[PDB]
Enzyme design. Structure first.
Site, mmCIF file in Angstrom:
data_model
loop_
_atom_site.group_PDB
_atom_site.id
_atom_site.type_symbol
_atom_site.label_atom_id
_atom_site.label_comp_id
_atom_site.label_asym_id
_atom_site.label_seq_id
_atom_site.Cartn_x
_atom_site.Cartn_y
_atom_site.Cartn_z
ATOM 1 N N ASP A 187 9.689 2.985 8.362
ATOM 2 C CA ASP A 187 8.326 2.471 8.417
ATOM 3 C C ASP A 187 8.312 1.053 7.864
ATOM 4 O O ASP A 187 9.261 0.636 7.186
ATOM 5 C CB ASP A 187 7.380 3.373 7.590
ATOM 6 C CG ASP A 187 7.664 3.504 6.074
ATOM 7 O OD1 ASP A 187 8.688 2.884 5.622
ATOM 8 O OD2 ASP A 187 6.916 4.179 5.354
ATOM 9 N N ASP B 5 2.339 1.637 6.775
ATOM 10 C CA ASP B 5 1.566 1.986 5.587
ATOM 11 C C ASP B 5 0.867 0.746 5.078
ATOM 12 O O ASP B 5 1.513 -0.271 4.823
ATOM 13 C CB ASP B 5 2.465 2.584 4.477
ATOM 14 C CG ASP B 5 3.225 3.835 4.890
ATOM 15 O OD1 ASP B 5 2.673 4.640 5.672
ATOM 16 O OD2 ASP B 5 4.361 4.013 4.428
ATOM 17 N N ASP C 242 5.954 -1.098 5.286
ATOM 18 C CA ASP C 242 4.883 -0.935 4.306
ATOM 19 C C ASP C 242 4.293 -2.302 3.981
ATOM 20 O O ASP C 242 4.979 -3.321 4.088
ATOM 21 C CB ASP C 242 5.373 -0.222 3.035
ATOM 22 C CG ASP C 242 6.318 0.938 3.278
ATOM 23 O OD1 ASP C 242 5.830 2.064 3.496
ATOM 24 O OD2 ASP C 242 7.550 0.721 3.228
#
Ligand SMILES: [Mg+2]
Ligand code: NA
EC number: 2.7.7.31
Length: 350
Positions: A195, A274, A197
């Site tokens: 991911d 995120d 962030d």
DNA sequence: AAAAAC
DNA sequence: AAAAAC
DNA sequence: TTTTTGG
């Protein structure tokens, strides 16, 4: 002398002991799945100290003076030196409970409890789970299966940089003065990750403006047909320090990244992003916390309590003897308060 | 409940 | 031998 | 699992 705390070591992305840390990482994962906190933590610490080493382990004398390595870790090191492999970790890799746990938790929205529930229901593959007429999936697991191939295939620096630009462009539309910082593994100089962030903060923002930002940005992406999954967790922040998650406002998204933004089949990629919205006064704490790595943070918190009588978390640093909260405008000030030498983000890969 | 995070 | 590891 | 046990 080598410290037992990751925060007093330099851990770059150059690992000379990957054959050793892979084995310890498997054994740690096996104890994390069987809940066993004690063994699991000792393997992560062992694996972590090995990653920090500026040389490879070729003999048992090479382990002398290195903290974190006890009678069991040394036995696994001695096993790898001899046969070139770990019989202990190879056992775990062939074990159905681990294979199934590794496979099931690899789905976005499936954690330890669902992975175990499924394993006990006789499931061993993701195909049988999706085919099963009786199972009922959460909105999160439905997204996780629908974009599985995209999420299981790691994201890279051109894609992360394309996401950063996209995030920045959305945020400055609603908050022009906003500071957006890419955290996580990419900030630690990693080449790949699961991911991307981000840490969003705004000096000139009102309390209503801070709370309504993640909703403004996600609805903006929804209108543009870019939002594939969204979950906004509201702030619980104040602030009582305790001996997890953060109380900051945050959201876990799956974004449609158009291939044209990076340098094909679909023409886009599902990317896990995120976003963390934090108050300006707590920015360094949030940046230190979201940068990681997991082991580095664990040891920052451990060193703070055991060696300094202080309490650190993602929101603040508290001095237990002075009975006061320590203020910081940068990560460098937090290290200073703790009595530590500053460790650059790309040296926190513990 | 369980899951999402470094 | 037993306990805490934040 | 490692470490500490009057360090
Ligand atoms: Mg990450
Ligand atoms: Na998962």
């Amino acid at each position: 002398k080598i410290s037992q705390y990751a925060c007093q070591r330099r851990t770059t992305l150059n690992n000379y002991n990957q054959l050793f840390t892979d084995a310890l990482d498997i054994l740690a994962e096996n104890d994390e799945l069987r809940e066993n906190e004690g063994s699991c933590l000792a393997f992560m610490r062992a694996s972590s100290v090995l990653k920090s080493l500026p040389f490879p382990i070729t003999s048992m004398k090479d382990t002398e003076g290195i903290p974190c390595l006890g009678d069991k870790v040394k036995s696994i090191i001695e096993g790898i030196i001899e046969d070139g492999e770990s019989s202990e970790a190879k056992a775990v890799l062939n074990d159905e409970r681990y294979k199934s746990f590794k496979l099931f938790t690899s789905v976005f929205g499936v954690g330890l409890k669902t992975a175990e529930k499924w394993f006990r229901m006789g499931f061993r593959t993701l195909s049988k789970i999706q085919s099963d007429k009786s199972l009922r999936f959460t909105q999160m697991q439905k997204a996780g299966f629908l974009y599985y191939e995209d999420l299981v295939s790691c994201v890279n620096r051109p894609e992360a940089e394309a996401v950063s630009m996209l995030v920045k462009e959305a945020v400055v539309t609603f908050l022009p003065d906003a500071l957006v910082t890419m955290t996580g593994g990419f900030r630690r100089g990693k080449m790949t990750g699961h991911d991307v962030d981000f840490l969003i903060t705004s000096p000139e923002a009102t309390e209503d403006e801070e709370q309504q930002l993640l909703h403004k940005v996600t609805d903006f992406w929804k209108q543009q047909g870019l939002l594939l999954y969204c979950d906004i967790l509201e702030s619980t922040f104040e602030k009582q320090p305790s001996r997890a998650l953060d109380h900051f406002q945050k959201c876990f998204l799956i974004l449609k990244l158009d291939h044209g933004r990076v340098h094909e089949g679909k023409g886009w990629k599902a990317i896990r992003v995120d976003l963390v919205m934090c108050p300006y006064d707590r920015r360094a704490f949030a940046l230190l916390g979201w940068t990681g790595s997991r082991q580095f943070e664990r040891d920052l918190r451990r060193y703070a309590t055991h060696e300094r009588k202080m309490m650190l978390d993602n929101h603040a640093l508290y001095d237990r003897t002075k009975r006061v909260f320590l203020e910081a405008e940068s990560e460098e000030e937090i290290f200073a308060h703790l009595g530590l030498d500053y460790i650059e983000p790309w040296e926190r890969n513990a």
